[PDB]
Amino acid sequence: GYISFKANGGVRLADEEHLASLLVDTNDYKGLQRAAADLQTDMQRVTGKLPTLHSQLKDAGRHAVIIGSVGRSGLIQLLVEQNKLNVADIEGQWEAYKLVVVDKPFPNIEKALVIAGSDMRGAIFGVYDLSQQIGVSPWYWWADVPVQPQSKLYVRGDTHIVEQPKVQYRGIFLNDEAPALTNWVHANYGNYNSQFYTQVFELLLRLKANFLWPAMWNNSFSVDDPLNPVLANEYGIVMSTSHHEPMMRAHKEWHGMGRWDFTTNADALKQFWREGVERNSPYENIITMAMRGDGSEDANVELLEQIVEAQRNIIAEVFEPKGKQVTEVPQVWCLYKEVQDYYEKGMRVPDDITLLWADDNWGNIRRLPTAEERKRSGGAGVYYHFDYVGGPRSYRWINTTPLAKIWEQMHLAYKYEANKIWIVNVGDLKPMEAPIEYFLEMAWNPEQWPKERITQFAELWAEREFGPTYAKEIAQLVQDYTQHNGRRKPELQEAKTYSLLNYDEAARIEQQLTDMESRAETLFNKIPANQRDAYYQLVMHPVLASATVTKMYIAQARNRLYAKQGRPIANSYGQQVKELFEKDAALTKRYHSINNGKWNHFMSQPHIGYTHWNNPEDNIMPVVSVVSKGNNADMGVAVEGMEPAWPTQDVAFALPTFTPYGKQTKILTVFNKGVKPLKFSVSSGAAWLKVSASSGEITHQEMQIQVSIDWAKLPLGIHESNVTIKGPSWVAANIKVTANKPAKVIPLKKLTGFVEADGYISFDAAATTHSKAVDGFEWQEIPAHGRTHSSMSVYPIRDASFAAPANASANTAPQMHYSITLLTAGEVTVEGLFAPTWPIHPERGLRYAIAFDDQPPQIVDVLAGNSHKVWQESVRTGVRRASSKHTLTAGTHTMKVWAIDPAVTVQKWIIDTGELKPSYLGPTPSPRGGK
Amino acid sequence: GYISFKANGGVRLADEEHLASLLVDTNDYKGLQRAAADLQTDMQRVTGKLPTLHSQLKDAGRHAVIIGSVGRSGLIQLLVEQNKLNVADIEGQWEAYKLVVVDKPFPNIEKALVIAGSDMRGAIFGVYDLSQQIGVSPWYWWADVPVQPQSKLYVRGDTHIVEQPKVQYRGIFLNDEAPALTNWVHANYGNYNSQFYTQVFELLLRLKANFLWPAMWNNSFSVDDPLNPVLANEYGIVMSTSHHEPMMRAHKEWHGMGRWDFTTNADALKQFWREGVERNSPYENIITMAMRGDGDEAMSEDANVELLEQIVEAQRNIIAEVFEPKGKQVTEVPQVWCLYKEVQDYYEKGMRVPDDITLLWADDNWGNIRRLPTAEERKRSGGAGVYYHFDYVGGPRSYRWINTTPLAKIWEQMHLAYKYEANKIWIVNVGDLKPMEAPIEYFLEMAWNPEQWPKERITQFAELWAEREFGPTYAKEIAQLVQDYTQHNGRRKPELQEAKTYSLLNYDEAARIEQQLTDMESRAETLFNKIPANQRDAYYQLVMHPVLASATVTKMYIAQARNRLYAKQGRPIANSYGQQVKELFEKDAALTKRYHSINNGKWNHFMSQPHIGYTHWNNPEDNIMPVVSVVSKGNNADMGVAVEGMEPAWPTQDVAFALPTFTPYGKQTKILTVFNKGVKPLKFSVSSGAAWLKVSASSGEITHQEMQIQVSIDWAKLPLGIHESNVTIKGPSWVAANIKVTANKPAKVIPLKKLTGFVEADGYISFDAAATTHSKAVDGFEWQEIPAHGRTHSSMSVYPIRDASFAAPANASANTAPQMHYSITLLTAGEVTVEGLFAPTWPIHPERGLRYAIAFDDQPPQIVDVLAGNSHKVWQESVRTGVRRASSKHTLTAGTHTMKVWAIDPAVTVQKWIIDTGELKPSYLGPTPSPRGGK
Ligand code: NA
Ligand code: NA
């Protein structure tokens, strides 16, 4: 950046006793003067010394910061008049600022940093740019991020920065606010009054945002404190309402006036709306239009048109005497659900009204502008969710939105030109600090944050708050817990989520999570003391809390399964459920206790015990089973991959089939259902079948027998034998083992591509062997996207579809090629895992084409078979799925994928060759041959 | 009876100081003299005085008992010579006896009871007939039944008893004997030696039985004590072996001689067999024939048949050779062969089976006889018999612990055996013997003469047995307790019971079963305190232990079921049901301790069989307390609602909450249960959305308790047709619970008394098979009631037993066969499904099924075969559940109908009909019988 912490011949903001003078015209915007005053205290935070703030150039010292708007600063204007400054690059622009150094701007001033803005907010944003660069995080108060001391602050002489936003209105919606934000606000401020809201306004400005929808569950912004809109307007925050709160009226303001129904109560509604728009007319707003009524298709469309027409006439009547026409008063309409269909079927919407497109409440944008809609003077915007109360189930507790998910969807919005308004539902605001800042930095300029800077954003954020030493590790912790929560909201997690039986999924997840926790715990003791509060609330708490909920359900799953199997070890897992549940409570209490209880109530959202879409009233520890012991030695055997334990009537006991490149060692677990010593023998029925022990003895512990194959002693083809385990009882346990060796087993080093094992071939979409670009379009990797690794998608963004390929050599579109080795000849099923995206362009699907070798390509639409139930499952799991069937010979093959429609974004491919088993995430990527 | 406890001018067996003299010839059979000595001691048990025992007429007093065999008593022979006695009615017969009074049999004797037998055992049985009549139960030792004291014993002067058995060989198999019998035997006798077996011999003779298969899991009768067979033969017990132990060799005796395989090891097997048969040749036996080799499974049917013919020929030659130097041809040496499973098929397809060998037909290990003789087979000189089970180790699951065989089940199957003439051998697997005392005696009394024990005396047997052991005052109540616990156990073996058996959701089944079991326990406990002190050991082991033990196991699984469901529903009350599981498991354990402690630990080990914790056919090594769930509470008030008939509790995503539909004659009050998942006070309101829908409360407040809301219909305010409304329950959360209620009133509701027959309600019509309106007899045949048969009430079957099928009725006018008619009232017009519950019987005559025909009103009859779709799996479920099922579909108008059932094939035995009119739900036993119209 442009700030140096040692002398550099530039502008001297601070150097020991010497501090630059801050200059702002007392006739400039009050909101800019206020921001200048914040810069004054910011510099004291950094240097320990308070710089002076003057309005007259004559009172300035040798070095100065000259702050002003082009329109109202006598300082900026004098510099322009005397050609010390040119503002042609910002003049007339929306929220632009220029930071430049000027030599001898005035006789008593040697050097000045000039901060010039096109308008009030432009100048404010330039001021807070400087605040952050000298070391004051936007989150210095809102997340206790310490301000690193500096005795020296210098501005580079060649500094020349010209900035302005790409999205015109950028901000947040405080929502889902009880119990957490609401009980904190009431404890600290009494209510959602202007002492609370000025803390919110300041945060938004420091993040270069300008837009707010206020808390409305049980509050009315303009009524609860008349200074709320006055201070919003003075600060520079543009106010609006959520999209079912029309005409500047909060939801709760409608009382004692009859039914919310325009067909029967229009006069009352119209007077209510008129007085609302009149009341807030002194302030900078965007007015919400239309309405959702309470209690025929052509009748609906007609009614909505009447309503909007009536609202337009109200606005005209209010603002006409104030010298404004209806087309000069910002207005917004969210065309939501059926209303979108109304609109596509020809409903009329005045051209100047902004069309706000909503996501699906789960981070997937439902609709974006078409080529013809982009011509509307009102433009369009996006309303996005980080938090939601509704179906299929609420998620309200901690951050569950990975940065890369945000990137991929908001980049589509940017490219399809929904750039009038970007607003995100932040729930209680905390603990969404990182994705809030990402969303708003992206809104400022999406081109400054391309997909190759997704990881870098998190690293840079961590470096700013905590310093460089552990920045990479801290960024990775955040990327890791958010990716994990992106797999399934904590509220939606349960015992059955991660598989105990297949591909060691629950065990792998538990280990991942535990390693994340250990990293987070360890750093707590290594960072400086004044970082601990910030670190706890921004990193350690969400990591430990996220891990604890999942581990709790995995322990529950084990308690339940092992109890069904009759294993007394089940009780130890029941004890683990209790410990993890208690740990969840202890973490919440810690969050409520740090920094003398500053953040008490913010983690009070219930998140354990959901049985339907709405939260329980409190956390409830999950149900556990209790296994009793007998007395005499009594043997059971648990078999890897199976729910029933031996002995069980009418069950064929078998280990999963061994394959040459699959899992090589599998477990039989012998256990005692009594207390007296249990002696047993173990024998194999074939020379190729190996067991790790020939006998054992146990009392209250279990014993694992490892089973494996000697492939050299196994004939070609499919063969079966038994492991026999003989305990005290005269009936021995016989566990069948099968091994399939279709041919001589070539060493993996000498194979090509991803190799079939254990009934499947699995690989990340980015693990291509070749990529072919066509007409400047190419499948490219989105780092850290999706549930397990990354995704691929076509860039640049098209607003047209490629032709499907006629044959498997057609170069109609960019392609991805993969290499595989198939052992099992026959029909395979290739499933892709995709971002759960919508048909954001009417009547256009999410098609791709796929073929092996020179077989005729098949067209697959990810959205084929779409339904409400299919959509529900796409947001519960975080992916959409699509598949195709192919017949292949044994040997090597090339899988080919062609792009067709835009916005198809694929993370993983899973090929079922016949024996694929269910899991939440799919098997981990297959063995890969040595080239 | 013929014994009086006051003077009556007959034979004075005892009167204070005066006792009759017992007379038996010292040249008569040793085993009869032995029985006479037991009578001497039995007399002392009753009177405290020992009668004298002499051989010489000179020594007798003025009253005497003269005991002898026709063939070897000089006493009996003299009486016959002088025409003081006639024995034409018993001479030459098998095991016959005669009890009569003779005046002045000799100069110094004024009166005598004469006990004359056609052969040794006939005489013995006569002796023990008298022992029992003076007051010594067969179970005086084996179940601690007290001997009532009497100072006076008189034989009525008109006594004239002539008895002989219908079944020639009658007895038991000690089996499944470890751990319980085996550990008791070892503690008391050291091993299965003659000190143990003479106790068994005596019991069998007192029960008028004569046949035994000995314990063979880890013992060899003839080897463990050489006196075993010596004393068996001397006492009069005919010895044999179980049907895979050929040629008088126990299973364990085969060791160190190579494979049990005739193809490769014939010479060793033959010598082994020859030595066995030679060893036991001095004793009265039936020799088990054939063999099951170790590798018969690997071999073709053709080869198996050839090999069996070879083996049996070789065995016959061995017997011929062994007995020729003795006085006997092979056709004079009793032999038996159980043609079992596929070997039965071998026989039906032409395998050679020598004509004089007795054919033993086994049951299916679950009390259903697999096969009985055909008309042509009854001509075979060897005859046929039945091997029956009271206990079994094997599939689908072992049952080893307590008595699970109701008397009426035994009656109906053994009666078929009798009428199809399998009367050469009746033998029953009794497991450890105890606690099968009542059904053992029943089986053996029936074997003695099935005609003395018709179905109309099934209840009476139990009452007479209770009266003998405990006296008349509470005999009927005691008999009812035994009938109740055995009926219940006949529904599902304790070993096979589990949480899911009895329904928590439908027809209040688990709650009703629990209450019936609790009330049975209360009767047993109340009676315990009323009986005399010296009857309490016998009462405990014969009545109270099995009653409480049977009840406790079922109640335990019901408590587990509630714990599991309520835990899934998130109800903290689940934890109290978890505690009940524990208490009931501990009670089971304590009852076992009590059984092992009575009478100074006399019966220690007999109840040690593990019976809780089965997961496959073979027992666990110890009882294991069932798994329970633990529910946790939150803090804040949080409302749930459990809905009667539904597993999910409110709130649950994607579930339509509704009470079962209300019908005019169905259940009138149904329950919504409001509960708190937290601890703080929970307030709520309750409202109905319709004037016809009534709720018992409009608001409530709970902390730790649940609250039931009763829901019901005001039928007068309900319009005709089907209507729905909601009960709305509003708690703390802003999301209210809406439970749908539906009521179906197809017409004006006539009072039940004005209706006729069984009335549709809640989607079904249900009634006992005996609840007929008419029972048409045809050609001397009639459907008749078997009392106490089946799972809930009784059964109906056609008698007399036929060995031919009626013609199926060609149409509604056909009077081909006896018919049962029932009356019903249907509210729901349309298709119905009529299911019958039947005895789980086999095709006991090859090529013949279990058909009946059924129709409503004048509609055409449909023929149903109960065995249609038969399979191993269908068989397994029939023995798990105790019934076979069959069904038919009919389309009926609303209104009154007559259901009609025609007999076709024999041995169709039906206990219950359940008609599904569209909404029948699953339950173990089916709904209780429907409301019955007054008309
Ligand atoms: Na929240
Ligand atoms: Na037993």
TrEMBL record, chain B:
Name listed for the protein in its UniProt record: Gylcosyl hydrolase 115 C-terminal domain-containing protein
Signal peptide: none
Alphabetically ordered keywords of this record: Hydrolase
UniProt feature coiled coil, ranges: none
Gylcosyl hydrolase 115 C-terminal domain location: 757-928
The keyword rRNA processing appears for this protein: no
GO process terms (BP): carbohydrate metabolic process
Gene Ontology MF terms: hydrolase activity
Domain BACON: 666-737
